[PDB]
């Protein structure tokens, strides 16, 4: 069985989050948690919460076993951007994009 957890509209660029997501692809959930605990990145905190939520979903909604769980699929998708204005010199104006992303984690006992 496959269980899914998502975090949509996360305040982080997709490029930054993908750096942390690649560290736990295909790893056991027990080992994946250890890797995230000792990664000095803001995206690591966001990813860890999603991974924990997926584990809880499998245990509660599917009666799975924690020791048998494994991270099978993980990917990050680009989300909507927020437009802002940043004044520059000599009266010029610039556009600032605040990027977001969608984080998806899939855990299965296979």
């Amino acid at each position: 069985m496959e269980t899914i957890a998502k975090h949509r509209h996360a305040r982080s660029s997709a490029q930054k989050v993908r750096l942390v997501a690649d560290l736990i692809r295909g790893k056991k959930v027990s080992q994946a948690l250890d890797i995230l605990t000792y990664t000095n990145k803001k995206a690591a905190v966001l990813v860890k919460k999603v991974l924990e939520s997926a584990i809880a979903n499998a245990e509660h909604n599917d009666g799975a076993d924690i020791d048998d769980l494994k991270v099978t699929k993980i990917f990050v998708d680009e989300g909507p951007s927020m437009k802002r204005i940043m004044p520059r010199a000599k009266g010029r104006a610039d556009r600032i994009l605040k990027r977001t992303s969608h984080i998806t984690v899939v855990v299965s006992d296979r």
Binding site: L19, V20, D22, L23, D34, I35, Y38, T39, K41
Partner: protein
């Protein structure tokens, strides 16, 4: 000062081939408390080499 042509997405990927992160190889285990911690660092509970250094 500025480019004459638009770089491709393949060139962008090549430049990022050295941006991957490195995970910690392994974690040490305390003799007494028995929790995982960074090597040469105290544990969350406040242990180091089974000596119970300051906790507060």
């Amino acid at each position: 000062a500025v480019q004459q042509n638009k770089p491709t997405r393949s060139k962008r990927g090549m430049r990022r081939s050295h941006d991957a992160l490195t995970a910690v190889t392994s974690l040490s285990v305390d003799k007494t408390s028995g929790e995982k911690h960074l090597r040469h660092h105290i544990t969350a509970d406040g242990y180091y080499r089974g000596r119970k250094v300051i906790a507060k």
